[PDB]
């Protein structure tokens, strides 16, 4: 066949029979294979030519295959390296995984089809993101009966901010009237600086347990993410919403995620707000746009607003809760 046409593949194996087996398998698929029997020979071959994919065995090499991985990463080539080991040297498998390796195979060669799967997934990751899609489905079903949504819901309820607090020398109060202790509308307020404050509001009743997870993930990273978008500046909340959509996508958190994101600068007396899913209003009154919840539409691509006030009163409500937020 002709799948691996023009695919330079390096095989660093020390047992001759396994060398021949791997080379015959790769050449049967049309790959241009280079074989080494020694770790130093491996290092030389690497200095010489760049293989599209590499296979290394840390089992009885002249130089530890894990040390060859260490060298490759120290050079920053970051070339793919599929490793071969056995049920032994579990720690070596760990060390390889900490290195930029792709997968692992047991020393016996029985499941060749899984080898084809892994090799193709590595060589054309975009084409074979079918694996990622299938795994997403599998883990969505898997999570249902291994995870404890009750514990996550309780943790989210426990982590909610105090009712009244001063952040960035801004007075801040919030009061929710929907049934509490059943996590619905959820808020987080963080200080981005001595003058910048930010917050997010999510109705976790729409995504279910995933929503709770999303909320938790937000409280872990929202600050960070916003700071990153503030790194490349002298705002732009919408990019933060899209990045949050992509975060929930990277984690296996499907469903609808109605969100609101706000940012107040005290010295600039400015509040900026964007909504994708959640209703809200806030004064000089302005009703925030409903928007399309995250995890849907691909990209909400919604608007912002600047009122240029010192104190504000914004009520935020969705199908799962109603809340008030106040800054004085």
């Amino acid at each position: 066949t002709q799948p691996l046409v023009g695919k330079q593949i390096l095989i660093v194996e020390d047992e001759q029979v396994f060398r021949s087996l791997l080379d015959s398998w790769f050449s049967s698929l049309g790959a241009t294979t280079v074989l080494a029997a020694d770790g130093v020979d491996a290092l030389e071959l690497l200095g010489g030519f760049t293989p599209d994919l590499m296979i290394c065995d840390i089992a009885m090499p002249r130089m530890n295959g894990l040390k060859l991985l260490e060298h490759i990463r120290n050079r920053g080539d970051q070339t793919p390296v599929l490793v071969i080991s056995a049920t032994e040297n579990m720690a070596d498998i760990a060390k390889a995984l900490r290195l930029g390796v792709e997968d692992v195979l047991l020393k016996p060669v029985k499941d060749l089809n899984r080898l084809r799967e892994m090799v193709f997934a590595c060589l054309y990751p975009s084409m074979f993101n079918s694996r990622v899609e299938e795994e997403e489905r599998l883990f969505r079903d898997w999570d249902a009966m291994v995870d404890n949504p009750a514990a996550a819901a309780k943790l989210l309820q426990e982590l909610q901010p105090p009712v009244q607090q001063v952040i960035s020398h801004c007075r801040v109060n919030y009061r929710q009237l929907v049934a509490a202790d059943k996590p619905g509308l959820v808020l987080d307020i963080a200080a981005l600086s001595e003058n910048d404050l930010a917050f997010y509001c999510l109705d976790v009743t729409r995504a279910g347990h995933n929503g709770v997870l999303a909320a938790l993930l937000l409280r872990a990273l929202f600050n960070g993410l916003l700071q990153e978008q503030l790194a490349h500046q002298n705002p732009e909340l919408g990019a933060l919403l899209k990045q949050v959509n992509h975060l929930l996508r990277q984690a296996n958190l499907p469903g609808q995620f109605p969100l609101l994101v706000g940012y107040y600068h005290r010295e600039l007396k400015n509040l900026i707000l964007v909504s994708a899913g959640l209703n809200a209003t806030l004064g000089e009154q302005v009703q925030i746009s409903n928007g399309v919840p995250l995890g849907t539409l691909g990209n909400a691509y919604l608007n912002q607003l600047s009122q240029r006030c010192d104190a504000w009163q914004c009520q935020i409500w969705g199908t799962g809760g109603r809340l008030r937020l106040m800054l004085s």
Binding site: T87, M90, A91, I93, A94, K95, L97, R98, D103, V104, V132, E135, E136, F139, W142, D143, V146, D147, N148, A151, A152, L155, L159, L213, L216, R219, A220, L221, N223, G224, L225, L247, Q250, A251, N252, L253
Partner: protein
Amino acid sequence: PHMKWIVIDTVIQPTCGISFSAIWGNMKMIIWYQSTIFLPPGSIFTPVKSGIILKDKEYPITIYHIAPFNKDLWSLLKSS
């Protein structure tokens, strides 16, 4: 026989009380679990129904989320 899964790395968020661990079993996975159990990188363990046998001791592990590994999400976790 017993499954021998290995913790590739782990991140703990003080903002929350969560431990995120990238682990290898037959494939790479990200687990969001309760911080109470501490799984340093390189730890080898056997999974069990709502539990983990490590060093011949069965710890009750509270799992929040199980997902396939994501390089981007894990790098984001490690940057906090």
